[PDB]
Design a protein around this nucleic acid. Structure first.
Lengths: 404, 224, 81, 49, 124, 146, 195
RNA sequence: AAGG
RNA sequence: AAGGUAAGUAU
RNA sequence: ACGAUACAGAGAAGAUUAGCAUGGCCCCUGCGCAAGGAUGACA
RNA sequence: AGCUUUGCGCAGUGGCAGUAUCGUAGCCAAUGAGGUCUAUCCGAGGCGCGAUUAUUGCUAAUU
């Protein structure tokens, strides 16, 4: 009877929104509000009713003209190294291996009272730039850890600061020397004599993770979280290529020492090797699971290494256009992957495992674990001389390593 | 994206559900669809309920009271047992909660043990990996014992705890990480007297780098 | 931004979590109590006189009490002056 | 409601003790320290009333 | 979207896991609600990790918690909703910061460690 | 109301200080909003009490009222019921002029309690059901005080 | 309230207050003189006198708080020095805090509880407040050590107390204050007085 | 039912 | 002189 | 216009009474739901 | 394969207290309710209003 109808009414789900109740009542044609009918009585009535019922082309041409001779020269350098007796190459190989295994924590300096997100060696291997989350970038002398020229920095956390390739060697200190990226996307240029930014590159409305110059020193590569990476031309003072190829945010960008290629490693878990001369994705990295947080083109010119959250460091061969070896480096998220700047002497890896490891570039076997620190190793860099290793960390300190 | 409920919210829900059930039962009784509830009687309640009847027929009243109590107990047992997980259904729930979704990714851990001669330890590793769906391989050498274990993060954590505390020469975690896809099957415990064929077997699955790391770490430990 | 309802199983926008939960667990006992209260306060007869009646009574009192009001003072009960 | 700042709550259980002690101070003020000591006698053998 | 000032923001899966762990901690009498209690736990070093919402207006009223977490070496994470975080804590009122305390012998220790490892590898 | 005022103002000042330490809302918009909220709460605390209806006396009733029995009724009957110690104290002997036992209140007497003519050789025991006990809320307060 | 109506009501209250005070004082003079009076008029007069006396007491306490202590330092020094010299002359040993293992601790507690219960010796009906207080007394008697521990805790740490109710025994010559202390504090005060 |  | 009326229904 | 008569007359008191179940609180037991902890087992 | 922890239901048995249990399209509340003690410390509901045989039903009597 009607008791069963009342039982049915209880089981009927009716929206608790007054506007939705009024809309449902009007849809059925019944009066929206009776006299003295509040929202609760309206809901009860609804329940009962329901129960009843051209610069790009010029830049590309310049990059090609700059890169082709360098690629050729690298080719004859490799041919000459092949002509070198195998005994000499082997001997210098174990000399390098013995030198690496003797590395010790040379120094330990508090960069700032906040975690240090990046560290970069100057081209003359005498100055070190550290990027901090406090919004301050600092320049440190390499042989002795002491602050020499602080920077006012950004307002948010600073992602990465990279020296100009010709800085401290050829161009004047008052010119552009450094490019720093922040957590708000702002990119600011710096000079070795002015604490305030020389210039403020704009256009990145979203956070940019890494910023690095082209080896020619004329183009600056920025990677945003807009699934995009941008190339900024210093001479033109305007971004050139806002390439959109990553499915997710783009974290790291690595340039080719020849200058012909550029590699972008993003949160898409896949990497892409764009062609700076033609603007087409020549080779598409695949195999990494989870976001890739590191990438660096080897000075050899045909090897690429990438570090991701898989606790792995995959080495990619450009000649075969495929991965060659997967290095299971560290037991936590890998961030910094970098080869020896001069040649393929070794591979340096850093991760959130508060440790760094060294691997032979050809053999991909461990040599020395740079154990130390007490916080996650955010970034690392090797000096152009090759015997200097700097590893910033979450421990608010950066450390130097030289053979002893 | 579920929303949790405060203790006051839970109390309100339970109270209003019980009140609705009580009102429904009272309406059923009053309407005539349900007989009125007889008083609940126990042994201590026997006289207070039917003293007049207990005097004339003591054993009959005792039998009636015990029959009512046994009816209540039988109803309780029938409710409990009716809603009981079948023995096979208990396994199905257990066989599923331990089956993590490796579609997103597989977690791989590599272990190196100095000595693995004990057959009981071998059986422990094999059974624990099999129950936890931890597909992998065990390669036995003179000093290197590569234990590649792949599966779910919960199973990986349990198995890591297994050899770290439950099972005892020492056990060292070489590398714990993730990969896109699995590369080994069930436990096999391959015997590898020499390094070359062990590396070849690891290359068959495409995971020779685990063997390389284990061998290099063992060599470094030996030199140290 | 739809969150599953823990009491009905449906989905509501997050802007209406707290109000939906408060309304959803509203006892009908509240409705019957409010209806009873409405019935009681709209059926009791007024006990005191209305305002105009109070004013008229006070005017009569002032007319018949010249020891308190007025200019001239007659006896307690007389009204002439 | 008011708070008592001056005077005592004579309805307290121990208010009898406070009153007697304060009155003893009064007796010290009135009799002085010499006549009171003569009346109370030496502390070794106190005098009777 | 969400305030970029809350950079260590958890995704949906980690949000669900964090809310489940917060509810379990509340059931185990191992949780402290509110930014003031989170600050007190951080100052006394009895906090496993700090979960705070990203809808706090202004967000600067809880942006001091990451600094205290860095000083005391305690993981911290940002959740996308201050209403779901409050519900996880067992309180109908929104909560913009909750602290999971340290209790020796607690059965939640393994889950707490797993959540700490997940959070500490997600900030960057 | 100054304790609640101090607590609320301290909470809002902590919020403002946390905002200020990051150099945000330099205009003072957060400060103005917090001050407005504080003033609104203070006004609410100072708000005059609402009109409250007078409850009339219940009309006298003579109709029969049915009251349930059971364990609760049994316990209330045991408590309020007449006790042998009180039944015997209500009985006063006829012509047995007793002696005054209480200076501070005359007429007070134990009646048949411990007196000749009571008819009981042994003294009546104290009924434990009439023992003094404290309230549940009072017991909670005492537990909290511990 | 508009200012003219507010001033009208203020004048009304002033006139009514004058009449009220005069009526209370005249009635009390009649009571003292022995004039034949009823119980209702005496109850109303007692209420009015309680209100007037308590207003005077509020004024007195406010004056004491505003004008500070009325005893100057010199008078206080003289009084304290006299008391100290008297106590030293008598070789008085100060009364110590009641020890936890005090021998006579239970006897004093029993005496205090019996003194508290003396107000109900001839009672026939019990108020709810009386019921609660007498239950407290019974609980303290049942567990003397817990009551003694609570008493020591109150004596050592308790410095803030709840409000006390005041009433006046209407002796026709003069009003006698009667103070109502909380039963929890009453047990501590009674034990302290006995000790 | 009867009385002024 | 009072504070000392039973309230009724019938005839 | 009372009063006389015939009748009633306890002319001053919801005097109610038991049983059970709900409800509160606190365990214990069984079953279900969702999570988890610790440990044992050779070829 | 057992064992066991927490929370939520559903029942069973047992104990305790009826000066208390509820209701909140009323208000305030972890962006801090409320603080006699321990206050650079405590951390959760409070208040107002309403219902009542200090939770509410039937059953049996007298009526």
């Amino acid at each position: 009877a009607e008791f069963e109808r009342r039982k049915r009414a209880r089981q009927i789900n009716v929206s608790t929104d007054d506007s939705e109740v009024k809309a449902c009542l009007r849809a059925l044609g019944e009066p929206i509000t009776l006299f003295g009918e509040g929202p609760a009585e309206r809901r009860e009535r609804l329940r009962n009713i329901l129960s009843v019922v051209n610069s790009l082309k010029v830049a590309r041409l310049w990059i090609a003209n700059y890169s082709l001779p360098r690629a050729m020269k690298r080719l004859e350098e490799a041919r000459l190294h092949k002509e070198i007796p195998e005994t000499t190459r082997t001997s210098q190989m174990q000399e390098l291996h013995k030198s690496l295994r003797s590395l010790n924590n040379f120094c330990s300096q508090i960069g700032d009272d906040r975690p240090i997100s990046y560290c970069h060696f100057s081209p003359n291997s005498k100055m070190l730039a550290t990027a901090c989350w406090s919004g301050l970038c600092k320049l440190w002398s390499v042989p002795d850890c002491n602050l020499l020229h602080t920077l006012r920095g950004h307002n948010t956390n600073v992602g990465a600061i990279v020296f100009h390739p010709k800085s401290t060697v050829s161009l004047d200190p008052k010119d552009v020397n450094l490019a720093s990226c922040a957590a708000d996307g702002s990119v600011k240029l710096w000079s070795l004599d002015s604490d305030e930014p020389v210039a403020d590159i704009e256009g990145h409305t979203v956070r940019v993770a890494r910023v690095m110059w082209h080896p020619s020193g004329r183009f600056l590569g920025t990677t945003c979280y807009d699934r995009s990476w941008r190339l900024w031309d210093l001479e033109a003072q305007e971004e050139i290529l806002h390439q959109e190829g990553h499915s997710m945010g783009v974290y790291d960008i690595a340039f080719h020492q020849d200058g012909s290629l550029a590699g972008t490693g993003g949160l898409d878990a896949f990497g892409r090797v764009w062609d700076l001369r033609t603007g087409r994705c020549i080779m598409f990295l695949e195999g990494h699971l989870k976001e890739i947080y590191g990438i660096n083109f080897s000075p050899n010119g045909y090897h690429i290494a990438t570090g991701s959250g898989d606790n792995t460091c995959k080495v990619w061969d450009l000649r075969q256009r495929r991965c060659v070896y997967t290095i299971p480096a560290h037991q936590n998220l890998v961030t910094g992957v970098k080869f020896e700047p001069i040649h393929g002497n070794f591979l340096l890896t850093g991760a959130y495992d508060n440790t760094a490891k060294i691997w032979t570039h050809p053999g991909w076997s461990p040599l020395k674990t740079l154990a130390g620190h007490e916080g996650k190793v955010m970034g690392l860099d090797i000096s152009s001389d090759g015997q200097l290793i700097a590893t910033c960390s979450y421990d608010r300190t950066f450390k130097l390593w030289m053979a002893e | 994206l579920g929303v949790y409920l405060t203790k006051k919210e839970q109390k309100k829900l339970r109270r209003q559900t019980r009140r609705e059930a009580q009102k429904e039962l009272q309406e059923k009784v009053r309407l005539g669809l349900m007989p009125p509830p007889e008083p609940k009687v126990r042994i201590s309640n026997l006289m207070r309920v039917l003293g007049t009847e207990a005097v004339q027929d003591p054993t009959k009243v005792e039998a009636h009271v015990r029959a009512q109590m046994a009816k209540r107990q039988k109803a309780h047992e029938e409710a409990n047992a009716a809603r009981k997980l079948t023995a096979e259904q208990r396994k199905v729930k257990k066989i599923k909660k331990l089956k993590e979704d490796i579609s997103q990714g597989v977690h791989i851990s590599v272990y190196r043990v100095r000595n693995l001669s004990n057959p009981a330890k071998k059986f422990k590793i094999e059974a624990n990996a099999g129950q936890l769906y931890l597909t992998g391989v065990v390669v036995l050498h003179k000093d290197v014992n590569v234990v590649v274990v792949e599966g779910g993060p919960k199973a990986q954590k349990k198995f890591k705890r297994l050899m770290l505390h439950r099972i005892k020469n020492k056990c060292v975690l070489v590398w714990e990480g993730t990969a896109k896809d699995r590369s080994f099957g069930e436990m096999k415990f391959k015997q590898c007297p020499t390094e070359n064929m062990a590396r070849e077997h690891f290359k068959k699955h495409g995971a020779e780098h685990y063997w390389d790391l284990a061998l290099s770490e063992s060599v470094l430990e030996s030199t140290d | 931004e739809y969150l599953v309802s823990p009491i009905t199983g449906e989905k509501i926008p997050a802007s209406k979590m707290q109000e939906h939960m408060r309304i959803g667990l509203l006892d009908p006992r509240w409705l019957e109590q409010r209806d009873r209260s409405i019935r009681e306060k709209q059926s009791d007869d007024e006990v005191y006189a209305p305002g105009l009646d109070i004013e008229s009574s006070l005017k009569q009192l002032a007319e018949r009490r010249t020891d308190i009001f007025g200019v001239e003072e007659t006896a307690i009960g007389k009204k002439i002056g | 409601n008011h708070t008592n700042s001056y005077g005592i709550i004579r309805g307290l259980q121990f208010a009898s003790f406070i009153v007697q002690y304060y009155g003893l101070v009064m007796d010290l003020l009135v009799l002085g320290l010499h006549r009171a000591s003569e009346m109370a006698g030496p502390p070794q053998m106190p005098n009777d009333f | 979207d969400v305030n970029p000032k809350a950079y260590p923001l958890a995704d949906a899966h980690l949000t669900k896991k964090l809310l489940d762990l917060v509810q379990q901690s509340c059931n185990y009498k191992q949780l402290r609600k509110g930014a003031n209690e989170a600050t007190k736990t951080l100052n006394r070093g009895i906090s496993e990790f700090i979960v705070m919402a990203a809808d706090a207006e202004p967000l600067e009223i809880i942006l001091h918690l990451p600094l205290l977490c860095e000083d005391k070496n305690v993981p911290y994470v940002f959740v996308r909703s201050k209403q779901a975080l409050g519900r996880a804590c067992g309180v109908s009122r929104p909560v913009i910061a909750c602290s999971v305390t340290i209790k020796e012998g607690s059965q939640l220790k393994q889950q707490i460690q797993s959540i700490q490892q997940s959070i500490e590898r997600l900030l960057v | 109301l100054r304790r609640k005022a101090a607590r609320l103002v301290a909470a809002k000042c902590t919020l403002a200080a946390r905002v200020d330490s990051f150099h945000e809302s330099t205009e003072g918009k957060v400060g103005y909003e917090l001050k407005d909220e504080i003033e609104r709460k203070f006004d609410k605390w100072q708000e005059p009490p609402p009109v409250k209806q007078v409850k009339p006396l219940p009309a006298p009733l003579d109709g029969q009222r049915k009251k349930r029995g059971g364990r609760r009724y049994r316990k209330m009957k045991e408590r309020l019921g007449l006790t042998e110690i009180r039944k015997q104290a209500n009985r006063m002997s006829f012509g047995e002029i007793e002696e005054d036992a209480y200076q501070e209140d005359l007429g007070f007497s134990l009646g048949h309690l411990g007196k000749s003519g009571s008819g009981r050789v042994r003294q009546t025991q104290v009924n434990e059901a009439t023992k003094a006990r404290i309230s549940k809320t009072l017991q909670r307060t005492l537990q909290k005080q511990s | 309230l508009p200012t003219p109506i507010e001033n009208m009501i203020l004048r009304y209250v002033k006139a009514k207050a004058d009449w009220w005070t005069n009526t209370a004082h005249y009635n009390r003079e009649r009571i003292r003189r022995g004039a034949t009076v009823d119980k209702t008029v005496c109850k109303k007069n007692l209420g009015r006198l309680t209100r007037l006396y308590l207003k005077a007491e509020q004024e007195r306490q406010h004056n004491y708080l505003k004008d500070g202590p009325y005893i100057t330092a010199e008078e206080a020094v003289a009084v304290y020095t006299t008391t100290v010299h008297w106590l030293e002359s008598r070789r008085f040993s100060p009364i110590p805090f009641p020890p936890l293992s005090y021998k006579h601790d239970t006897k004093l507690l029993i005496l205090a509880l019996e003194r508290l219960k003396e107000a109900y010796s001839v009672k026939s009906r019990l108020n709810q407040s009386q019921r609660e207080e007498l239950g407290l007394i019974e609980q303290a008697y049942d567990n003397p050590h817990e009551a003694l521990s609570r008493i020591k805790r109150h004596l050592l740490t308790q410095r803030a107390f709840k409000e006390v109710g005041i009433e006046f025994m209407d002796l026709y010559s003069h009003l006698v204050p009667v103070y109502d202390v909380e039963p929890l504090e009453k047990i501590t005060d009674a034990y302290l007085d006995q000790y």
